[PDB]
Amino acid sequence: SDLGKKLLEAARAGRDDEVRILMANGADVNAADVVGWTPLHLAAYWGHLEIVEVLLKNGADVNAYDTLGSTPLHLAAHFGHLEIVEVLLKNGADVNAKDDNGITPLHLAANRGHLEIVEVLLKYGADVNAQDKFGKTAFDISINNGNEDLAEILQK
Amino acid sequence: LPAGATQERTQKVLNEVTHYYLTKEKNNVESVFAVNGFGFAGRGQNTGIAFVSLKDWADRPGEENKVEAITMRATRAFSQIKDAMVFAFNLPAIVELGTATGFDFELIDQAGLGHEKLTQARNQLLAEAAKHPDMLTSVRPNGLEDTPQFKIDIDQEKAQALGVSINDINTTLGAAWGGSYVNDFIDRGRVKKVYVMSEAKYRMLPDDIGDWYVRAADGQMVPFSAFSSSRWEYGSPRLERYNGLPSMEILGQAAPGKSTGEAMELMEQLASKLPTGVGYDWTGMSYQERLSGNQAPSLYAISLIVVFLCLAALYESWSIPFSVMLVVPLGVIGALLAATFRGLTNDVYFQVGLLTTIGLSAKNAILIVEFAKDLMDKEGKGLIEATLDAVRMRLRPILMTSLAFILGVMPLVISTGAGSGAQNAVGTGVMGGMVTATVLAIFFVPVFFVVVRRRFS
Amino acid sequence: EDTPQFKIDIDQEKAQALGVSINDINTTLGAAWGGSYVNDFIDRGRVK
Amino acid sequence: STEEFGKILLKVNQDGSRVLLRDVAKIELGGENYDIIAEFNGQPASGLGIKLATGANALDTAAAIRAELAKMEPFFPSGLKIVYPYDTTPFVKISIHEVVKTLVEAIILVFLVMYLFLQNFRATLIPTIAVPVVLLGTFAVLAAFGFSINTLTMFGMVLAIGLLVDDAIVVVENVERVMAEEGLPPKEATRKSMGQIQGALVGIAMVLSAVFVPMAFFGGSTGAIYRQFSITIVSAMALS
Amino acid sequence: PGADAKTVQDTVTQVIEQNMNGIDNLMYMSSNSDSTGTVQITLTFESGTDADIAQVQVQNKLQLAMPLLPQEVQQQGVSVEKSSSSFLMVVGVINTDGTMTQEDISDYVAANMKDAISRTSGVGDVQLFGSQYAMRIWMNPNEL
Amino acid sequence: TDADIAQVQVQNKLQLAMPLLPQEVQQQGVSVEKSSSSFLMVVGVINTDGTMTQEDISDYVAANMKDAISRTSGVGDVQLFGSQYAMRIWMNPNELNKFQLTPVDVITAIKAQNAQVAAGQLGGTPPVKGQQLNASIIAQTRLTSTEEFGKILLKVNQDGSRVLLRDVAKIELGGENYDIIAEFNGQPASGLGIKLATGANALDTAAAIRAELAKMEPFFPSGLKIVYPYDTTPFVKISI
Amino acid sequence: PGADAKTVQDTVTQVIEQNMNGIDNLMYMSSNSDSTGTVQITLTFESG
Ligand SMILES: CC(=O)O[C@H]1C[C@@]2(C)[C@@H](C[C@@H](O)[C@H]3[C@@]4(C)CC[C@@H](O)[C@@H](C)[C@@H]4CC[C@@]32C)/C1=C(\CCC=C(C)C)C(=O)O
Ligand SMILES: CCCCCCCCCCCCO[C@@H]1O[C@H](CO)[C@@H](O[C@H]2O[C@H](CO)[C@@H](O)[C@H](O)[C@H]2O)[C@H](O)[C@H]1O
Ligand SMILES: CCCCCCCCCCCCO[C@@H]1O[C@H](CO)[C@@H](O[C@H]2O[C@H](CO)[C@@H](O)[C@H](O)[C@H]2O)[C@H](O)[C@H]1O
Ligand SMILES: CCCCCCCCCC(=O)OC[C@H](CO)OC(=O)CCCCCCCCC
Ligand SMILES: CCCCCCCCCC[N+](C)(C)[O-]
Ligand SMILES: CCCCCCCCCC[N+](C)(C)[O-]
Ligand SMILES: CCCCCCCCCCCC
Ligand SMILES: CCCCCCCCCC
Ligand SMILES: CCCCCCCCCC
Ligand SMILES: CCCCCCCC
């Protein structure tokens, strides 16, 4: 649609007032670009907290997956957006969601060493023993990266 | 077209563009050179240009069939094309000047902030510029925006485990998907390149990655799926740098009735309130003006000073020079009237025209003051007697030059043909200026001479 | 003025006997004691 | 050849069958890259972007390019056609001609105006000689400065004709006036006439120089354009 | 060939830019590294600078930076040219009877037209709109 | 002698010698420079807040200041009084021998796993018909940190355990060389020894250097400060 | 090295000569490619 693609652009740029108007005019929250990214994907990526919250109120799929199986929680957990991770999880984001590679939000959060985000994901019941296609845990990543603070938390 | 759009999508729009010109403008348009995959803003599959070549100036009569009118209709007609910015525009007379009122701003990463922090600072600057539409218009980036790109992580452990070398992996991937220039061959006595690459159908989609196999040390073929993992991220398809530092070029122009200098001063003010380690600089036309504007006052001053000193020496008088020098506005008023009422601009042709109009009015005035002054010095005549005799003797040769010259530029003013833009810019300001310079100088120069001699008695 | 310098002689026969290549010997000696510029990396956005 | 590349041996199997390059790939002569699709009225296209050499004549080069393409015509394959989507030469050819017409017409108009007021053919000839001597002489001074005949230098001259025409008209008119008022013979009349104006004419030269010469000393792209008008107008005015 | 903007910038553009030292009358330097595998570094000089001296000085500093560039970039070549947007004319060449692709026409022009135009009186520079032929090996991963 | 033409002639000849030089010498960059042998000025750099070491300041000058001064007209040569940082892999021969590894294994791993790979595009030209997707493929990129260099996998043991580069070497940012160490009035410092280009004006170049230094000062980290411990130009300016 | 005249003309002499166009004050250009694989391209310029 016309407004679907204007919401894709607006969600990416963090234009809060334009999203509000597009939400009023019934712009498709489930609109997706070629790689399969919704506004919520784009909001989760670029760290636009208010738009994540607005899109979820307007019935956006919290567990929408791109053409490689990645969810908004993957993007927020990977790029260190703590508030968005918490908001997505409140609105029922799948904490153990796996992309085509078997990579969970916990793996991505562990890899970029986001301590607070790993602790939040664990509170909402993250499988610490979840293995990617190469049989690697979040623990294996913390040992290989040599993050000692992160190694403590994942030891349970 | 929007970012991530393919060659075929751009080809479909160019076909519509070509079709319009060969249909709606078939009386005017000789040809359309459709160049898919090329734009000045940047290269890529999602951009293209149509170079429209017109019929002879004779075969396109009237204003309806000129590049102004066709550009208008074309841009307006292409308004309705969905998923495409499509606009026509005329070439500038000289390509390298750009526009007056326009500026060329460089936003500079001065502290290793990175691409994304420079992007945020640019958006912050663009946002603030938009909040001053009274001063700045079309404040835009010259570069491209970040686009989806396919990040693929070669697992080093699983690659070593299976006995697949990284060089065989990176070569397989790069050669197949990117192409590899291998060496040269001789085709009919001309050295030419040899490229290996994947046939199109095996390098289109993320699924195709798995169809590529690499031979391990032990002779077993291993697909990419076995030792790789992919995810979508955003990244730049065009990274700008200015003086060795990461940059982002911002184009824009001064709002109607504003000078470029004012617009530039606001852009400097707004830029001072950007995050830590974000510098700025002026390039191209802006760098040129910023230095050429410093020069003007000196050259205006030196010009006016030497004119006075020359007239002072000619007349052997510090005061009389002013009688000649006061003629300057009499020429300039008619130029500005003729230019304004014809809807032309203060261009270089107009500006040099003012100097020739000022020069010829100054010339006329010099010979009136010379004749008058000599009648007083040699023949001991009175100020008014000498002035009235001077202007009597000079009336004929002034009206002759003016009548000849105003008829001489008359064709350039009314010219509508090829190169009429320059002819109009030359003719209009001169013809208008010469009418006032002639009409006023014959009545005002005597006034200037008398008033000045009285004031300095 | 001339100065004491450590002359090392790589016995070619003994290397061939043990199956150690001269390239590996010269790289190992040269990289370790002299230093070797391997390739480039990016340090806060600048190539080094 | 594609045939030779097709036959390149990749491996020999155990059984004895040979794996050639044509068995695992399609060999064709193609482009170096496929980023651009050039088309001209829908038909596939290529072309030559041609540039003028330092100090070359744009009109000569264009004529020379067309002569060379004419010699290539009979050797083209079936369906091949030359087209000229962009060419500055027709435009320049007109630009120079329209200026030359203006300068010729300007001298014709002076002849008509000189005859209207003074009403003898001998007086009309003197500017008809003097002005083309100056206009023609200006080109020699343009050659001294290493300038080209271009849009700027040529419109530089039509801006100047007001000054070039006046210098001619002022000298002749003032001789005709002195004769009419004092009844002197032409030789003595000219001595007196020039006696009145020669100091003023030197003064006008020094004044006009002071106006125009400072245009030359502006810097950058804008300064380079003004310098074309400056050297041209100062040179024409000085000769005049 | 096949390089993303960052790969071009971080192996070519930065390495060249870092070596543009000891050149005379340089006002400013600007560069674009883009996803079509291309880099373009424009060095703009003072008005009245000898363009031939400015070009050889840039070329000379490049030649000494060439060993630091990737093997693929060394192979393709790095071009140093004087910046001119102004074309005298664009000669278009077309096929009206469908026998020739744009790649077929471009090869004909390179082989049978370009050089003779280059050699023509007053022609300063000739640019081909397209490329001469390349032996394209189109690989098949299933057969491989 | 024209210094420009001397440089061109000397370097034309050097280019003949260049491919006969060892690969290590080519990769350190050979330089042809036309400068005065003496220093025009020394631009010193210190940290008044003692926040940055000699090595930190030297790296800042090398990475944020030198290049622009080097590019400034009249600057024939710039000596950094210190070193730019490099990724230093300080190898341990005891830990290397334990895992049956050599510097040759280390160098090959750093080449393999610190690589910027050209990987082409999804939906790249020439494409198949009906392609909607066009995106760059991003494979390996240059390592950016000590952590990532430490994380380099040299070898996987038979029992599955990983030998990383940090297991056989201390890894840190540190000088390309550790030969030059400067002090300003006893305190840690770096600087630029600037030599005037052959025939260049000392005063105009010094002015240009000071102009370029002014453009950097705003974006300095806390404490960093330019000092002027040596300048030949002030005497010329004052004595005149 | 080791290339015949015909090969060296095709791969070197013509490749260089193609680019020698549009140089200032070039009167004529003469060149030879020989069996030892040597190229000489002499460009002769206007007097002065
Ligand atoms: C007939 C007319 O109108 O003017 C013609 C006539 C013309 C002024 C010619 C340009 C130029 O040779 C002129 C000079 C001074 C050239 C030098 C000498 O040899 C003169 C003896 C000759 C007399 C007139 C002439 C021969 C014209 C031109 C300009 C042609 C050039 C271009 C770029 C199209 C013109 O046609 O506009
Ligand atoms: C009466 C006033 C006297 C003062 C005015 C003098 C004006 C002088 C202007 C310069 C005219 C000479 O300029 C010269 O013109 C000829 C003929 O058009 C050009 O000749 C060239 O262009 C023409 C037109 O496309 C071609 O037919 C011709 O084959 C080609 O060689 C020369 O390239 C140019 O150098
Ligand atoms: C670095 C040097 C730069 C110098 C620049 C100064 C420029 C001066 C402007 C030009 C002024 C011309 O100066 C003028 O020349 C004429 C010469 O015919 C002088 O001579 C005058 O005396 C004769 C005597 O028979 C009179 O008939 C006549 O009235 C007049 O010609 C004038 O007294 C002088 O006013
Ligand atoms: C008789 C006294 C001489 C007056 C003319 C002197 C001014 C011109 C000096 C100069 O060289 O400037 C060149 C300039 C470059 O853009 O050309 C111009 O723009 C034209 C000059 C502007 C109009 C002058 C009238 C002002 C009325 C108050
Ligand atoms: C006042 C007339 C003097 C004419 C001098 C002509 C100089 C010839 C210059 C030649 N060239 C254009 C090649 O430089
Ligand atoms: C025949 C008299 C011509 C005098 C014109 C003087 C032009 C000075 C040139 C200035 N500049 C060096 C900047 O080019
Ligand atoms: C360019 C203007 C300079 C001003 C010179 C003033 C001279 C006035 C003196 C009058 C004495 C009669
Ligand atoms: C630089 C301007 C010179 C003008 C001198 C005027 C002198 C007037 C004295 C009465
Ligand atoms: C006689 C008039 C000459 C004017 C010279 C102006 C030159 C200005 C240089 C800055
Ligand atoms: C404007 C032209 C005047 C000439 C009139 C006719 C002369 C006999």
Ligand SMILES: CCCCCC
């Ligand atoms: C007597 C006149 C002198 C002119 C100076 C240029």
